[PDB]
Design an enzyme around this catalytic site. Structure first.
Site, short mmCIF file in Angstrom:
data_model
loop_
_atom_site.label_atom_id
_atom_site.label_comp_id
_atom_site.label_asym_id
_atom_site.label_seq_id
_atom_site.Cartn_x
_atom_site.Cartn_y
_atom_site.Cartn_z
N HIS A 80 -14.99 -12.33 -7.17
CA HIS A 80 -14.57 -11.39 -8.19
C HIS A 80 -15.54 -11.35 -9.37
O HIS A 80 -15.76 -10.28 -9.94
CB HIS A 80 -13.16 -11.74 -8.67
CG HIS A 80 -12.30 -10.54 -8.93
ND1 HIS A 80 -10.98 -10.64 -9.34
CD2 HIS A 80 -12.56 -9.21 -8.82
CE1 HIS A 80 -10.47 -9.43 -9.48
NE2 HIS A 80 -11.41 -8.55 -9.18
N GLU A 94 0.81 -1.21 0.00
CA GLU A 94 0.00 0.00 0.00
C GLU A 94 0.85 1.27 0.00
O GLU A 94 0.37 2.31 -0.45
CB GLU A 94 -0.95 0.02 1.19
CG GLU A 94 -0.28 -0.07 2.54
CD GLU A 94 -1.02 0.71 3.59
OE1 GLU A 94 -2.27 0.67 3.58
OE2 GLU A 94 -0.36 1.36 4.43
#
EC number: 3.4.17.23
Lengths: 490, 596, 97
Positions: free
Chosen positions: B486, B356
């Site tokens: 997904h 991140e």
């Protein structure tokens, strides 16, 4: 290593000030001469210390073999500046006047830049004469005259007696035309394949006696002794018995003081930097300056002043500089627009709301205001303008621009292909650097014919007591003593 | 006058207004990541509804502009990003039925529960199922769970998939595109540049050549994996034949991380476990973040803003205000970034922190770009750069430089093979399946196949390509590969494939240009100003320009590179080549475990 | 006079030792941008000075070389290196250096 002996130069170091022949003349001239009976520090090197070149360093040597060369002159003699060398060898001058970093002696480390070079003959004039101790008497004078570095020379042999009381005349030689600065001086002794007398020449008048052959057989100082001053005034080497009015004596001013009125004008410079309800960029404020105080500390210490760049007038030599009116305009932008603020440059805000002209003199100041002109959940009070026909003229206001139009089609209000130029300027306390609300003021300098009454603190200085000083009372320049009086001034 | 100026003015107005509204909605989304309170979520849904309404209204205004009379490349990219309407191109009834079916998909995927023979145990979706999968190796249990989940989800999903292909090719026609696969490939559309234009079928050719060059190595690694499984189950694997679908390694056939205890070559020697070292040192999450920033400064990336350390959550503020901690960190707009972790002192938490951090650095890099191009040039750039940050952190050389690992440590070949096998099998098990589903979505939305040639061709192709045999034969009414979160809301796997290949390419180029010596793996990219500027010169670009020029600047070639797959597992492959003499090579499609 | 101070050293503002550009630390020199777009007061004038020393030294430059044969023991006007004057020139027995 070298020693630090201290001796007296006696009478020595007299050169020809000009290139004009004088025969049987007692001509009197004032130039950079060696004061008579002035102490000269003599180092015996078997090292190479630093010496400040202040007002014509003089040199001499009484060695027994060729060991000393390499005259260098410059500011700090290193650190990428021009330091030059006068290193010599017994073929030619071997001038090495260039810009170096380290040489230790031709012999050098970094070429860098360079300047005048010249070789004609051994500058040290290495002749052994007859005896072994010819001493290769190294009398020279190095001085700065409007950038014309001058060099003299005299190879008069001596017998044992260092710093001898015998007189000598230093003939001139070539001079360096380099218009550089010189602060210090060191003697870079040469590399292998009773040498130092730094008689600094303070300026002083000299009376010189010329022979019938033009040689300077004898000279006398003009400020060494009262008798010398009397001889200097009489322009003769013999003085008869009696009283002579030589010169006048005064006490030199110990200190200089500057006085001025109470300097109390009290411009609201602090008030124009804290008026919370600021104006947006689409309508920038403007103020008129007259009979104010130019206290630039608030401009210097108050606020982080994130922006301090300006191109017209130096913000350092500004406290004393004084005008009448200054056009200061206040508005709030983000981080990048502060950088985009400039003369002759692109940028949406600077091109459509406030343009700085190319001939703009003044300093633009912006600081950080992250908590004052911002609030949580949104700050929609601030506005800005985004559209116009073309580049905005400098110092222009375009308030109430109606509604911007495009497409060559009539429009009535905020709708298709016709939008309101006043787009929202959302300000929040959680913007990262580039979008944080930044407060910027643009204050312009104008060379004004109006009386400049905003001139700064005027440098008020305490005025001693009973001391000869230079006073400047309310612009009254003069020199004298100051004391408490019993006058009846109205 | 000219349409370009009108488009520019609109674009400026839209960018300003939409950046304000996007800052508001991103603040709402961050408060959603933080709080879960009802008043909060009411603010958040009202904010996102107003943002959607504003976006639709601006799209309606912008529909007037044409397409031919645009000459600036940036303006062309802005127009291409703007003209995407999506569901707004259809009618109100079509939009309402589409959103209703999306709501149905979300509800069924959220509340899907499968019952075992004993009804006292309710398998609650993925949680619990993944734990049983990881901590248990019961063939009957896992096979029955997967079979029931498929026989429910696919049975419910079969007609809705046909509805989806019909509706999506209708959207493609609304966008004037050949099919929905081409509609996705429009994100890789380059026009108006000489020697630089690449169409959609170029990606098909690239994936074809990548498959051609990975077939033998994928065959070798699959053979090794099935041999490892056979060493633990001798009567459940046909060595000469392919491996059954229920033996890929995980519950969906996606991950291969479960195959770790029985696949490590030398399990006796311990792996790189620095967790004990930071337990000794008593490290903190804030100091780990500071170390990450120091590493990013070593790679010459700009320093993080003070607001990043001020406003952003770093450690859990009690347990009453519970927070979700999925690895994700997006910008709030106007230069504001924040991060959310369920951080502890371990290795995986630091790895996702670096991931991140790369995400946030890439997000900061393009902050000077406008809103329509305020994104990566593809749908996986941020994930790829996060992965390359994580890999840069993963090398033990970085640990040695940092000092967390004791200097008196000796690198061993078996340890290197173990680390490479772990960090490979964690990602590469997904690589066959991601295109195995992406190509099938492509071909289904193409319209080149009939309805009754889907499941049989599915299974036959996966066997003959990777070694994935159906253990329990099923007819054409199933959707076994369509039981993933997904694919619940029609999310493409193009992003995952491009992430996997692009992150590879990034790290290989970085190690090549970092004057490294020896094997490319186990090499960090830090304290390298030249390579940091090499990153930055393309990081600052973003969506403004296609990826190809940044790729030629980073590596030197213009098309996709196939070298990283070969040269990233070179020690593993060299060690496997000598052992291949005693292991059979090849698989037979016709062989299935239940043909007795 | 006739001094060169070539140096790029930060000129601090106030008393802080700041180095660089921006807050109270300034570069010694600023832009000298030249365009045909400013006025006559900012046009790029290219000027050169010529400095001479009219002093009693052997002249190195003499202008147009004109030489008349020197005569002695006669009343003439002499222009030796710009030494304009009149008188009778006779050889001397001095000790000129």
């Amino acid at each position: 290593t070298t020693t630090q002996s201290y001796t007296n130069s006696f009478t020595r170091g007299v050169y020809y000030p000009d290139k004009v022949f004088r025969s049987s003349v007692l001509h009197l001239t004032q130039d950079l001469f060696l004061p008579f009976f002035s102490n000269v520090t003599w180092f015996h090197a078997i090292d190479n210390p630093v010496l400040p070149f202040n007002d014509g360093v003089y040199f001499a040597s009484t060695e027994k073999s060729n060991i000393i060369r390499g005259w260098i002159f410059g500011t700090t003699l290193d650190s990428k500046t021009q330091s030059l060398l006068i290193v010599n060898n017994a073929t030619n001058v071997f001038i090495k006047v260039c810009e170096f970093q380290f040489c230790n002696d031709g012999v050098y480390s970094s070429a860098n830049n360079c300047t005048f070079e010249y070789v004609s003959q051994p500058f040290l004039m290495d002749l052994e004469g007859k005896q072994g101790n010819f001493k290769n008497l190294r009398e020279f004078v190095f001085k700065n005259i409007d950038g014309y570095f001058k060099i003299y020379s005299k190879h008069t042999p001596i017998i044992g007696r260092d710093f001898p009381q015998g007189f000598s005349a230093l003939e001139p030689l070539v001079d360096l035309p380099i218009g550089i600065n010189i602060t210090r001086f060191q003697t870079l002794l040469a590399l292998n394949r009773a040498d130092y007398y730094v008689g600094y020449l303070q300026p002083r008048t000299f009376l010189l006696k010329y022979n019938e052959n033009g040689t300077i057989t004898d000279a006398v100082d003009c400020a060494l002794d009262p008798l010398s001053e009397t001889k200097c005034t009489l322009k003769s080497f013999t003085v008869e018995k009696g009283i002579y009015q030589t010169s006048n004596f005064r006490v030199q001013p110990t200190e200089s003081i500057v006085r001025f009125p109470n300097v109390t004008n009290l411009c609201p410079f602090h008030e124009v930097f804290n008026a919370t309800r600021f104006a947006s960029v689409y309508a920038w404020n403007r103020t008129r300056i007259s009979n104010c105080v130019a206290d630039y500390s608030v401009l210097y210490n108050f606020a982080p002043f994130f922006a301090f760049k300006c191109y017209g007038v130096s913000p350092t030599k500004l406290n004393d500089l004084c005008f009448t009116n200054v056009y200061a305009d206040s508005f709030v932008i983000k981080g990048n627009e502060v950088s985009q603020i400039a003369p002759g440059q692109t940028g949406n805000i600077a091109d459509y709301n406030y343009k700085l002209p190319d001939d703009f003199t003044g300093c633009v100041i912006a600081w950080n205001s992250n908590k004052l002109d911002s609030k949580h959940s949104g700050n929609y009070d601030y506005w800005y303008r985004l559209f116009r026909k073309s580049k905005l003229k400098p110092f222009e206001r375009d308030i109430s621009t109606e509604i911007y139009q495009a497409g060559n089609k009539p429009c009535k209000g905020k709708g298709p292909n016709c939008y309101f130029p006043l787009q929202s300027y959302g300000f929040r306390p959680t913007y990262g650097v580039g979008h944080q609300p930044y407060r910027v003021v643009v204050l312009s300098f104008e060379l004004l014919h109006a009386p400049a009454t905003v001139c700064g603190p005027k440098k008020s200085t305490n005025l001693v007591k009973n001391k000869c000083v230079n006073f400047n009372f309310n612009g009254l320049t003069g020199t004298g003593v100051l004391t408490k009086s019993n006058k009846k001034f109205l | 006058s000219t349409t370009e100026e009108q488009a520019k003015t609109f674009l400026e107005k839209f960018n300003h207004e939409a950046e304000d509204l996007s800052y508001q909605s991103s603040l709402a989304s961050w408060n959603y990541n933080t709080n879960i309170t009802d008043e909060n979520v009411q603010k958040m849904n009202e904010a996102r509804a107003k943002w959607s309404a504003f976006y639709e209204e601006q799209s309606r205004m912008a529909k007037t502009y044409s397409l031919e009379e645009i000459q600036n490349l940036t303006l062309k990219r802005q127009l291409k990003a703007l003209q995407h309407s999506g569901t707004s191109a259809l009618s109100a009834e079509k939009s309402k039925r589409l959103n209703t079916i999306l709501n149905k998909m979300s509800t069924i995927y959220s509340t899907g529960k499968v019952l075992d023979p004993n009804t006292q145990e309710c398998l609650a979706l993925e949680p619990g199922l993944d734990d049983i999968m990881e901590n248990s190796r019961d063939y009957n249990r896992r096979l029955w769970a997967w079979e029931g989940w498929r026989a429910e989800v696919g049975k419910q999903l079969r007609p809705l998939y046909e509805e989806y292909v019909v509706l999506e090719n209708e959207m493609a026609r609304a966008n004037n595109y050949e099919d929905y696969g081409d509609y996705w490939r429009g994100d890789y559309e380059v026009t108006g540049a000489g020697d630089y234009d690449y169409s959609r079928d170029q990606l098909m050719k690239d994936v074809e050549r990548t498959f051609a060059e990975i077939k033998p190595l994928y065959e070798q690694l699959h053979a090794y994996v099935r041999a490892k499984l056979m060493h633990t189950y001798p009567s459940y694997i046909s060595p000469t034949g392919c491996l059954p679908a229920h033996l890929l390694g995980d519950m969906w056939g996606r991950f291969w991380t479960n195959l770790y205890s029985l696949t490590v070559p030398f399990e006796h020697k311990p792996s790189i476990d620095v967790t004990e070292k930071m337990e000794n040192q008593s490290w903190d999450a804030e100091r780990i973040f500071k170390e990450a920033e120091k590493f990013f400064v070593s790679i010459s990336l700009p320093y993080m803003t003070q607001g990043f350390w001020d406003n952003s959550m770093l450690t859990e503020p009690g347990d009453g205000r519970k927070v979700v901690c999925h690895p994700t960190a997006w910008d709030l707009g106007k230069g504001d970034f924040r991060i959310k972790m369920c951080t502890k002192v371990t290795m995986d938490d630091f790895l996702t922190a670096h991931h991140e951090m790369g995400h946030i650095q890439y997000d900061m890099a393009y902050a000077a770009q406008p809103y329509l191009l305020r994104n990566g040039a593809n749908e996986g750039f941020h994930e790829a750069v996060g992965e390359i940050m994580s890999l840069s952190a993963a090398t033990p050389h970085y640990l040695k430089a940092l000092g967390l690992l004791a200097p008196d440590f000796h690198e061993d070949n078996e340890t290197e093979i173990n680390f490479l096998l772990k960090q490979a099998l964690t990602i590469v098990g997904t690589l066959p399946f991601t295109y195995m589903l992406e190509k099938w979505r492509w071909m289904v939305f193409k319209g080149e196949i009939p309805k009754q040639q889907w499941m049989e061709k599915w299974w036959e192709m996966k066997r003959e390509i990777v070694g994935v045999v159906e253990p329990l034969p099923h007819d054409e009414t199933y959707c076994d590969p369509a039981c993933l979160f997904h694919v619940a809301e029609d999310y493409s796997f193009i992003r995952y494939y491009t992430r996997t290949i692009y992150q590879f390419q990034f790290h290989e180029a970085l190690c090549k240009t970092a004057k490294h010596e020896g094997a490319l793996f186990k090499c960090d990219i830090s304290n390298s100003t030249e390579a940091g500027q090499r990153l930055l010169q393309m990081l600052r670009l973003g969506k403004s320009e296609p990826w190809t020029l940044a790729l030629e600047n980073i590596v030197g070639i213009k098309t996709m590179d196939v070298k990283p797959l070969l040269n990233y597992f070179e020690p593993l492959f060299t060690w496997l080549k000598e052992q291949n003499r005693n292991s059979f090579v090849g698989w037979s499609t016709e062989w299935t475990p239940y043909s007795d």
